[PDB]
C-alpha cells in the first residue's frame, strides 16, 4: 500500500525531531526492528561522537564504584575480548 | 593486597580512557550493563541519545528506511510510537 510514500513529505520533519533511542525499544517489542536493525540505528560510526558517548557511559558507571567496574570488565570480556586483555594485562 | 578497591578501581582504567572511548560502540554493551543492574533505563537513554541534529537526522533516516521495508506493520508501529513519545509530531503527520 501507500502509507509510507504518503509520509515522505514529512521525512525531514521526522528526522529533525525524533531521537531514535526513545522509540527503538517500542519498535523492537513490536517486532518491526530486529536486533541487528536496532544496533544499526543506534551505532556511532563517527569517532568524535562515539568517544563522547563512551565517556558519559564511563562516568555513569564510575558513580557505581566497584560494581560498575566489574560489570564493565565483564562486558569487555564478552564484546571486546582484545580490549579486555589489554586493560586487564592478560 | 587489593589494588582495585571500590575507591581506586576506576582510577586504574584512567590510563586506557582514550582507547576505551575510541573502540567501544556503546550501544553494543549498554543492554548487557542494564542486565548487570549497573545502568538504569534513564542512564542508557542518556548514553545513546544524540544531541547533534546532523547525527540524529541520519539515524532517523536509517530507521525510517528499515521500517518502510516492513510495510504496513512498520507504519502502524511507527505511528504508535509517535502517539506515545512525540505526540505533537503524531498530530502533525496525521493532520491534527
Swiss-Prot record, chain A:
Effect of residue 66 to A: Strongly reduced zinc-binding
Protein name (record): Caspase recruitment domain-containing protein 9
Source organism: Homo sapiens
Compartment list: Cytoplasm
Comment on protein domains: The linker region, also named autoinhibitory interface, is required to prevent constitutive activation and maintain CARD9 in an autoinhibitory state. Disruption of this region triggers polymerization and activation, leading to formation of BCL10-nucleating filaments.
Signal sequence annotation: none
Domain of life of the source: Eukaryota
From-to range in the entire protein, with total length: 8 to 97 of 536
Disulphide linkage map: none
Subunit description: Monomer. Homodimer; homodimerization is mediated by the CARD domain which forms an extensive interaction with the adjacent linker and coiled-coil regions; leads to an autoinhibited state. Homomultimer; polymerizes following activation, forming a nucleating helical template that seeds BCL10-filament formation via a CARD-CARD interaction. Interacts (via CARD domain) with BCL10 (via CARD domain); interaction takes place following CARD9 activation and polymerization, leading to the formation of a filamentous CBM complex assembly.
Variant or mutagenesis effect after changing residue 3 to A: Strongly reduced zinc-binding
Effect on the protein of changing residue 50 to H: In IMD103; reduced cytokine production in response to C.albicans infection
Entry function: Adapter protein that plays a key role in innate immune response against fungi by forming signaling complexes downstream of C-type lectin receptors. CARD9-mediated signals are essential for antifungal immunity against a subset of fungi from the phylum Ascomycota. Transduces signals in myeloid cells downstream of C-type lectin receptors CLEC7A (dectin-1), CLEC6A (dectin-2) and CLEC4E (Mincle), which detect pathogen-associated molecular pattern metabolites (PAMPs), such as fungal carbohydrates, and trigger CARD9 activation.
Tissue expression: Expression is restricted to several populations of phagocytes, such as macrophages, monocytes, and dendritic cells. Highly expressed in spleen. Also detected in liver, placenta, lung, peripheral blood leukocytes and in brain.
Consequence the record notes for mutating residue 84 to H: In IMD103; does not affect formation of the CBM complex but impairs formation of a complex with RASGRF1
Record: residues binding Zn(2+): 3, 66
Annotated disease: Immunodeficiency 103, susceptibility to fungal infections: An autosomal recessive primary immunodeficiency disorder with altered immune responses and impaired clearance of fungal infections, selective against Candida. It is characterized by persistent and/or recurrent infections of the skin, nails and mucous membranes caused by organisms of the genus Candida, mainly Candida albicans.
Annotated ranges, domain CARD: 1-90
From Swiss-Prot, chain B:
Annotated effect of mutating residue 36 to A: Does not affect zinc-binbing
Sequence positions bearing Phosphoserine: 1
CARD domain residues: 5-96
Tissue expression remark: Expression is restricted to several populations of phagocytes, such as macrophages, monocytes, and dendritic cells. Highly expressed in spleen. Also detected in liver, placenta, lung, peripheral blood leukocytes and in brain.
Effect of residue 90 to H: In IMD103; does not affect formation of the CBM complex but impairs formation of a complex with RASGRF1
Recorded consequence of changing residue 34 to Q: In IMD103; abolished homooligomerization and formation of BCL10-nucleating filaments; reduced cytokine production in response to C.albicans infection; reduced production IgG antibodies in response to C.albicans infection
Protein role: Adapter protein that plays a key role in innate immune response against fungi by forming signaling complexes downstream of C-type lectin receptors. CARD9-mediated signals are essential for antifungal immunity against a subset of fungi from the phylum Ascomycota. Transduces signals in myeloid cells downstream of C-type lectin receptors CLEC7A (dectin-1), CLEC6A (dectin-2) and CLEC4E (Mincle), which detect pathogen-associated molecular pattern metabolites (PAMPs), such as fungal carbohydrates, and trigger CARD9 activation.
Free-text note regarding domains: The linker region, also named autoinhibitory interface, is required to prevent constitutive activation and maintain CARD9 in an autoinhibitory state. Disruption of this region triggers polymerization and activation, leading to formation of BCL10-nucleating filaments.
Involvement in disorder: Immunodeficiency 103, susceptibility to fungal infections: An autosomal recessive primary immunodeficiency disorder with altered immune responses and impaired clearance of fungal infections, selective against Candida. It is characterized by persistent and/or recurrent infections of the skin, nails and mucous membranes caused by organisms of the genus Candida, mainly Candida albicans.
Known partners and oligomeric status: Monomer. Homodimer; homodimerization is mediated by the CARD domain which forms an extensive interaction with the adjacent linker and coiled-coil regions; leads to an autoinhibited state. Homomultimer; polymerizes following activation, forming a nucleating helical template that seeds BCL10-filament formation via a CARD-CARD interaction. Interacts (via CARD domain) with BCL10 (via CARD domain); interaction takes place following CARD9 activation and polymerization, leading to the formation of a filamentous CBM complex assembly.
Protein name (Swiss-Prot/TrEMBL): Caspase recruitment domain-containing protein 9
First and last residues shown, out of full length: 2 to 97 of 536
Amino acid at each position: 500500500d501507500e502509507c509510507w510514500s504518503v509520509l515522505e513529505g514529512f521525512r525531514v520533519t521526522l528526522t529533525s525531531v525524533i531521537d531514535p533511542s526513545r522509540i527503538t525499544p517500542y519498535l523492537r517489542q513490536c517486532k518491526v526492528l530486529n536486533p541487528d536493525d536496532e544496533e544499526q540505528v543506534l551505532s556511532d560510526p563517527n569517532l568524535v561522537i562515539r568517544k563522547r558517548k563512551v565517556g558519559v557511559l564511563l562516568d555513569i558507571l564510575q558513580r557505581t564504584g566497584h560494581k560498575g567496574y566489574v560489570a564493565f570488565l565483564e562486558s569487555l570480556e564478552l564484546y571486546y575480548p582484545q580490549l579486555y586483555k589489554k586493560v586487564t594485562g592478560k
